[PDB]
Amino acid sequence: GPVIGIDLGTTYSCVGVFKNGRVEILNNELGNRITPSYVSFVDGERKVGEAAKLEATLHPTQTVFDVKRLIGRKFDDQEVVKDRSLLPYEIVNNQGKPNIKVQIKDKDTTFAPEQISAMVLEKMKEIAQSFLGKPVKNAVVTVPAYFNDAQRQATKDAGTIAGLNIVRIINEPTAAALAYGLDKKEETSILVYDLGGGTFDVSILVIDNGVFEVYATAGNTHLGGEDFDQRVMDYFIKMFKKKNNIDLRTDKRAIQKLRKEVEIAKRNLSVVHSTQIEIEDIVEGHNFSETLTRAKFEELNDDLFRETLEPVKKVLDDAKYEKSKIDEIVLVGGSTRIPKIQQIIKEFFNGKEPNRGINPDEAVAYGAAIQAGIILG
Ligand SMILES: N#Cc1cn([C@@H]2O[C@H](CO)[C@@H](O)[C@H]2O)c2ncnc(N)c12
């Protein structure tokens, strides 16, 4: 049978197939290579992906996301106590474990995290089946290198619920190394710098005659692209209030429209120096129209960019490594396209240039699909 590769991310998932000797990263039905890991339970319908994410503005308690933060953990774990205070959907204690509670046609309905992750895996499965024109029963699925056995097993259980035999779990650093075709002969020490939408992970990965070992891992579970957007949002909400006597936080729809344009402006500023953020009638009778520069984008986020270096010093200290011991730096996550991030990493490594791809958001799924091909022979 076919074996597909799935990057099951905190904020998004991505599915790849290995076919006639190539990895193809598959578009969802809206033509995107990345699917938001959102599931909504509104008005008797269940939605998965972008349509679910759009429900979050008006139905925040019914729109489930960031389930990867809960999967295989205990309700009283210090990380889960913190996530319950941040997440707007209800999390309950079922026998020591966090479960998600929502309403379906007004009825209280409880889900284990693996049941929500299974709904994301089933959408990625369907994208594969439709593209390949046959049923898919097998998958390689990625996890963070810091996942323990209970987190890996709950990920395998999500696959079983979705009708997927997960024939192999591989860590995100390993998947990145396969995607970039890092040479497997002799011994190489790789720093994998992974800055996504919601989380930051860094690992030291050593490749030794085709054996992959993560020697050390550290990160920041609340530092990613979304934090950079929120800093811009905070600035423009202050400015619009100063100029127009309108506080855009009082209108949830206005906030949703601004967040969309701010995300687009951030992306543009990875290439250009100046971009316009425009919304006709952000509220009735009032247009939003501002310029954001790369310099103001950086000024608003420079403390958060520099915080990424704290886990980097920690993994070097944990592995008793000198900076010069790192043979290469590999960047994964869309947020590594930010020019200031690359510059700060280069400077920390006394001038050594980091390796990036052109699609860092797809590297992990790409490597999962490579592992699928390696397993089929
Ligand atoms: N294409 C693209 C980019 C994606 N991301 C971010 O990666 C995160 C995960 O997808 C998310 O928070 C997103 O906004 C980018 N960030 C900066 N510059 C870019 N050019 C991109």
DSSP states along 49-66: SHHHHHHTTT-GGGEE--
CA 185 to ligand 1 centroid distance, Å = 33
Our answer on whether the CB atom of 259 is closer than 6 Å to any ligand 1 atom is no
Q: How far lies 289's CA from each of 244, 269, 314, 330, in Å?
A: 12, 17, 42, 37
d(CA 309, CA 214): 19
- Is residue 214 classed exposed, middle or buried when 0-12, 13-18 and 19+ CB atoms within 10 A define those classes? buried
**Tokens coding 275:** 């971009």
Query: Contact at 8 Å (CB) between 166 and 139?
Result: yes
**Tokens coding 351:** 């001038």
Catalytic residue among 66, 83, 194, 328: 194
d(CA 146, CA 281): 46
User: Residue 97: which domain range?
Assistant: 3-172+364-376
CA 125 to ligand 1 centroid distance, Å = 24
Beta bridge partners of residue 314, listed in sequence order = none
Is residue 194 annotated as part of the catalytic site, yes or no?
A: yes
Our answer on whether the CB atom of 335 is closer than 6 Å to any ligand 1 atom is yes
d(CA 256, CA 236): 13
Cβ neighbours around 264 below 10 Å, total: 12
Beta bridge partners of residue 104, listed in sequence order = 107
Q: Compute the C-alpha angle 237/243/247, nearest 5°.
A: 40
Query: Contact at 8 Å (CB) between 79 and 19?
Result: no
> For residue 142, what is the domain's CATH number?
3.30.420.40
Report chain breaks in the chain, C–N > 2.5 Å, as residues after which they occur: none
Is residue 157 annotated as part of the catalytic site, yes or no?
A: no
85 Cβ neighbours under 8 A, 6+ residues apart: none
* DSSP alpha helix (H) spans, 96-211: 113-132, 149-161, 172-179
355: left (phi over 0), alpha (psi -120 to 50) or beta: beta
- Identify the residue whose C-alpha is closest to ligand 1 atom 8: 197
- The structure was resolved to a resolution in Å of 2.2
Our answer on whether the CB atom of 371 is closer than 6 Å to any ligand 1 atom is no
For residue 274, give the H/E element and its range.
Answer: strand 274-283
Is residue 314 annotated as part of the catalytic site, yes or no?
A: no
What are phi and psi for residue 305, nearest 5 degrees?
A: -55, -45
Mutation to probe ligand 1, out of 33, 361, 362 (largest number of atoms < 8 A from CB) = 361
Q: Tell me the residue type at 356.
A: R
User: Token match 């690359």: residue?
Assistant: 342
Q: What atom in ligand 1 is closest to the CA of residue 361? A: 10
Beta bridge partners of residue 39, listed in sequence order = 48, 64
What are phi and psi for residue 85, nearest 5 degrees?
A: -65, -25
Catalytic residue among 7, 83, 229, 261: 7
Pairing between β-strand 12-19 and β-strand 35-36 as defined by DSSP bridges: antiparallel
Q: Tell me the residue type at 85.
A: S
